[PDB]
Amino acid sequence: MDKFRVQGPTRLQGEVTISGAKNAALPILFAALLAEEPVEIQNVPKLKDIDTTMKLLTQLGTKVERXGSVWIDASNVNNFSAPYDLVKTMRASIWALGPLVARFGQGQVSLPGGCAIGARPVDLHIFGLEKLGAEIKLEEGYVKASVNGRLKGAHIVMDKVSVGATVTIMSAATLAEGTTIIENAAREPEIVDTANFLVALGAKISGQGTDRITIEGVERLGGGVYRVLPDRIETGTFLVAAAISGGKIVCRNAQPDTLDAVLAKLREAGADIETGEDWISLDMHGKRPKAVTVRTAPHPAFPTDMQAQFTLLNLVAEGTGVITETIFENRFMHVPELIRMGAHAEIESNTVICHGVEKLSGAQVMATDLRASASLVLAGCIAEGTTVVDRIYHIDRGYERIEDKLRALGANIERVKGE
Numbered sequence: 001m002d003k004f005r006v007q008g009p010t011r012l013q014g015e016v017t018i019s020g021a022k023n024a025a026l027p028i029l030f031a032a033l034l035a036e037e038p039v040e041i042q043n044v045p046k047l048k049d050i051d052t053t054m055k056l057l058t059q060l061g062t063k064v065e066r067x068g069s070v071w072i073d074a075s076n077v078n079n080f081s082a083p084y085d086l087v088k089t090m091r092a093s094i095w096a097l098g099p100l101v102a103r104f105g106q107g108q109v110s111l112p113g114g115c116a117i118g119a120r121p122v123d124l125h126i127f128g129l130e131k132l133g134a135e136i137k138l139e140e141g142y143v144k145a146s147v148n149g150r151l152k153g154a155h156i157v158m159d160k161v162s163v164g165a166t167v168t169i170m171s172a173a174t175l176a177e178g179t180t181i182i183e184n185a186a187r188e189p190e191i192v193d194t195a196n197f198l199v200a201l202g203a204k205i206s207g208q209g210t211d212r213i214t215i216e217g218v219e220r221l222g223g224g225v226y227r228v229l230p231d232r233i234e235t236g237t238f239l240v241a242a243a244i245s246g247g248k249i250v251c252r253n254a255q256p257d258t259l260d261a262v263l264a265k266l267r268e269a270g271a272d273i274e275t276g277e278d279w280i281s282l283d284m285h286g287k288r289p290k291a292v293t294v295r296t297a298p299h300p301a302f303p304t305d306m307q308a309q310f311t312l313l314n315l316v317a318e319g320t321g322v323i324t325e326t327i328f329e330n331r332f333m334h335v336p337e338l339i340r341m342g343a344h345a346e347i348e349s350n351t352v353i354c355h356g357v358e359k360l361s362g363a364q365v366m367a368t369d370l371r372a373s374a375s376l377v378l379a380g381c382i383a384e385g386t387t388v389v390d391r392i393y394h395i396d397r398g399y400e401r402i403e404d405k406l407r408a409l410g411a412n413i414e415r416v417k418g419e
């Protein structure tokens with residue numbers, strides 16, 4: 001059971017290169033299934049889901065290779081089923097569905113448990129495909145989609161916003177006959193990025209990043225080279241790492257425009273920020289941060305994925321700051337952990353009241369959410385003494401070797417075992 005042993009305090013500073021976004025990488029790999037020619041998917045981080053998708057892909061008949069890149073040649077796909085064995089660990093597996101039937105005429109993805117008493121609905125994908133003209137076949141534990149010929153552009157109004165469904169529907173639509181409109185489509189940068197990837201393969205997509213995405217079906221998708229966008233959340237974590245340690249940090253391979261809310265929020269914290277087209281700088285000038293007020297909300301507003309981090313920030317800044325989760329609930333489980341570190345806060349309903357304190361104290365802490373989990377490691381950094389963060393596999397799944405990046409930042413950190 002991997003644990004993070006952190007020795008603090010230490011001012012985090014210097015340079016950090018941001019990994020590709022796990023959440024743009026995933027949809028793009030599945031979308032690659034659409035490519036009739038070899039594709040170079042660049043800037044793909046090395047995470048477990050990447051490994052899982054690669055397997056799933058190989059299993060489909062696609063020649064799959066990786067490094068910084070993930071080389072994909074899909075023109076041999078002859079197995080149209082993501083088996084229970086492969087999709088078991090990965091929800092995103094569902095993304096195999098649309099590409100399969102849109103390009104091949106059929107696709108079957110396994111629904112682990114599915115109707116398993118607690119199963120995150122996958123209905124949007126299934127129903128989206130249906131609107132597109134796909135024949136659906138449902139039996140406990142699986143979903144089969146097929147179609148005689150091409151998919152049929154359709155007008156789809158989404159009742160629930162879904163990053164997931166948006167990728168499915170938008171992906172299948174690139175091959176369908178005619179035009180497809182997605183109302184209430186997810187607006188996330190990762191969607192814009194997946195759409196851009198498709199346009200790169202010859203697809204006709206517009207409105208990516210808005211509420212309405214329009215897709216004009218085309219003949220076939222080619223190949224090419226494509227760089228996955230940077231990890232916006234990863235970038236924010238690192239910005240925050242310096243913002244709370246009085247550090248100065250430069251984020252390499254970043255993408256400023258995906259962090260409007262986060263950047264403005266840091267300025268409020270008194271941070272000194274500069275940006276270029278591919279880099280972001282944050283400078284505290286040895287200064288402790290100022291308490292800020294935050295409202296997480298749907299993109300492009302303040303990203304809930306930045307919450308645990310800003311909370312931590314507030315917890316060590318000058319003043320009082322309230323962080324309010326407007327959409328999500330129960331997003332404060334990691335706070336008691338921070339309190340065990342000397343932090344002062346009151347969790348009230350969907351909000352956390354923060355009383356910035358001078359210095360944190362080492363402690364054995366733990367969290368399930370990668371973000372909250374990352375914040376703990378961050379805390380270990382600036383806290384007095386020894387901090388041991390348990391079950392860091394959570395972080396390993398979404399952060400590409402955070403310890404290495406942290407060490408180069410001046411952090412005293414050891415990956416240790418408790419088993």
Ligand SMILES: O=c1ccn([C@@H]2O[C@H](COP(=O)(O)OP(=O)(O)O)[C@@H](O)[C@H]2O)c(=O)[nH]1
Pocket residue numbers: 091120121122123124125160161162163164165
């Ligand atoms: O087929 C679907 C897809 C999404 N959702 C709902 O929309 C939320 C967020 O969807 P999204 O695709 O953004 O994320 P995911 O569910 O993949 O974690 C989910 O938790 C569900 O509550 C649903 O009910 N059915």
